[model samples]
Target: TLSILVAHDLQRVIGFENQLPWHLPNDLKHVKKLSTGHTLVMGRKTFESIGKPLPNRRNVVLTSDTSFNVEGVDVIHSIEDIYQLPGHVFIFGGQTLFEEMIDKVDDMYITVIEGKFRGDTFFPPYTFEDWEVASSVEGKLDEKNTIPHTFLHLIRK
Candidate 1:
């Protein structure tokens, strides 16, 4: 299955200055649990932001620049090329890539942070018309991360 994984605030802001706006450790673990061992496809910028390929996960990067290359990642020049990858796939992001693949994903794993945030990048606008929540779990506030959150697993209807 091809899925999308992300954490966003009320305003749909997913990034700030090439990185996440908050430090929510629990959400990071949630993403790891879900995406581990899966093929994670992301745009070049997203791959760069991470500094290195994520361990234990297959990393596929989308980029138009032909010379773009990373030792630990599989680089492809277009979004359509991602369709050729095998097994469970997860579209990790940086706004552009997510927007391009939104309609093609079969599922979505989202962590909704319980607050508004200011960021330059945003997740693309989407609706529940063709999707339904499969399951959800609430996350509590802790000293490290004061914001509450909810992890939602949604599947195409």
Candidate 2:
């Protein structure tokens, strides 16, 4: 089973134009904390956003098309091939990839920003009945801004 980790707005989940969009704070820390010692799976676009393989993690890029290329990233055509990799796998998203495996995911680490956004992409909706809320923590933006953001941990049944 794969653990798909990401955060999305209720309005805009991800970007078709930019998967790893700007305005996301502390994201490098989030990616490093979870994936530093682990393997991460992402689509070609998501991988391209990094522009290089992440250090200390086995980077796997999922692609349906044949022409995608990068030196350090291990390119796989399917999520079903995840078992062949070493260490725990984290599925980061671009859009279609996350939607495909959302149902079978073991756990979800989601950051919910209190602010709203306008975009062309969206997060996949899941049933509350199928998942159990594990835990969550509220985040503080800064001294002046109190736009309450939360990190939600969820487990699938």
Candidate 3:
């Protein structure tokens, strides 16, 4: 099952200048929780932003750059090759990757952090009606994560 794991602001901005625009510890923790034992697929810049292969899971990078290679990550050059990967793969992405593979996702985990912020990249537009909210989550804003947010687990219907 291929899925998407991402967080974006209320305005749909996923990042600014190659990094996340805000700090939300719980949101970060949530990624680790769900992605710990699965396949993670992302683009070149997203992998660079993360800097290294996330331990404990398979790291798959779908990039066009032929010269790129990493010690522990599998570098794939095309989207069609993703289907050969095994179960529970999560598309941990950049805007372009998400935009290209969004229709192929079987489900998704989305964190909608409230409030607007400046960013150069935004999550691509997709049909929300194609999925059903399997679960929803809201939380208290603490000092460490000074933002109101909600998490949604949506499965394709």
Candidate 4:
């Protein structure tokens, strides 16, 4: 089953990185290790949030503008090319791609926060009918690690 992992509020999801409050390292390493050596599909904003190419992985940036380009990064406008990509592909987000690819993903890794921050960005809403938690661990903050968050593993029905 293909599943999309989303993180957001109760009402609706927000866009990523729009000059608002952001969290700490939290689950970044968890996300990184999970997708290491695997393809990561992300929108331009999500890619830009990292500011550089992440090492040892295939980073595919989704963009509509032909003018978009990143060194050492594979940019695509369609999910068809992304789905056929080798290895497991992680759909890291920005609002557009998350909403567009919601039905086609197979697995998800989410970092839920203990506290909420006022923000313009949010994750997608999911149906409990089609997905369920596979595993989860409550995590903490470490300057050496990152921000505080809980790592959630979800599988599609």
Candidate 5:
């Protein structure tokens, strides 16, 4: 199965200067719980922003630069290469990869944070006609970060 895991603020902003705009520990924890022991496919910039391979997951980087190599990352040139591999994988992102693979996703796990943000990157526009909410949690303020957010899980129609 191919899934997409992403988060965005109220304005649909996903990143600021190649990094996440907010520090929400709970969101990080949620990501860890769901993505652990799974294959993760991400863009070069997203991998760079994350700084290192996430523990216990296979990290695959999508980059045109063949010379780009990191100690723990497996490099592949295109999204097509990723799809050719045999396994369930999650598309982690920077804007470009998301734009390319959004339509191919089988499931979407999105965190909708409750605030607008100033960011250089935004999640690509998508319509709900082909997707239906499988599960959703009401927004709640994280005890530690104090940011309200909702977690939504959607399945393709």
Candidate 6:
């Protein structure tokens, strides 16, 4: 199944300066537990910002760069070959990546944070009209996780 995993603030902002706008350790841990063993697909800039291929997961990068090549990850130019990928696929970053795959995804895991944040990029606008909420859980606020957030898992109808 193709799924997307991301955290957006109240303003629908997902990123700022190539990184998460807020510092939340629990959010990182949650993402790790869910997608660690699966294959992750993201755009070129998203991969660049991450520095290196994340361990224990297959990293697939989408880029228009014809000669783009990176060690330890499969690079593709477009969404034409998305169906040929192996196992479960997870779309993980950059607006364009999500834009292309949004319609193709069968599921979505979203983290909606409770505060307004300054962001350079935002998630594509979407409504769950044809989706069924599989689960929704709110995170507990604490020292390491000061902000309020809700993790939602939705499956397309």
TM-score of each: 0.96, 0.87, 0.96, 0.82, 0.94, 0.95
> lDDT of all the models against the reference?
0.89, 0.75, 0.91, 0.69, 0.88, 0.88
lDDT of 3 by residue, 61-137 (tens): 99899998889999999998899999889999999988987888989899998989999998887666788999999
Summarize candidate 5's per-residue lDDT along 103-131 as a digit string, tens digits: 89999899988888889999887778988
Question: Looking at model 5, which ten-residue stretch has the lowest summed lDDT?
Answer: 138-147
Look at candidate 3 and give me any clashing residue pairs.
none
Enumerate clash totals for all models, in the order shown: 0, 0, 0, 12, 0, 0
lDDT (10s digit) by residue, model 2, range 37-134: 88888888777777898899888999987887678888899778876876678888767778887877789887776666655667788876988889
Candidate 6 residue lDDT tens string, 47-145: 998889989988999988988888898998878777788888889988878777778899999898989999999988888797899999999988789
RMSD of model 6 against the true structure:
1.1
By lDDT, is 3 or 4 better? 3
- Better candidate number, 2 or 4, judged by lDDT: 2
Model 4 whole-model lDDT (C-alpha atoms):
0.69
Ranking by lDDT: 3, 1, 6, 5, 2, 4
Instruction: Name the regions of candidate 4 deviating beyond 4 angstroms.
Output: 1-20, 142-148
Query: RMSD (Cα, Å) of candidate 1?
Result: 1.0
lDDT of 1 by residue, 1-157 (tens): 8899989898899999999998899998887888788899998888889999989989998888889877888998977788899999999997998898889999999999889888999998778888898998899778987888999888989
Mind giving the per-residue lDDT tens digits that candidate 4 earns over 9-114? 3344343345324455545566667777777788888778778778888888988879877787998988787767776777777777787887777777776665
As a TM-score, model 2 comes out at: 0.87
Q: What ranges in model 5 sit over 4 Å off?
A: 139-142
For model 3, the local distance difference test gives: 0.91
Q: What is the lDDT of residue 51 in candidate 3?
A: 96
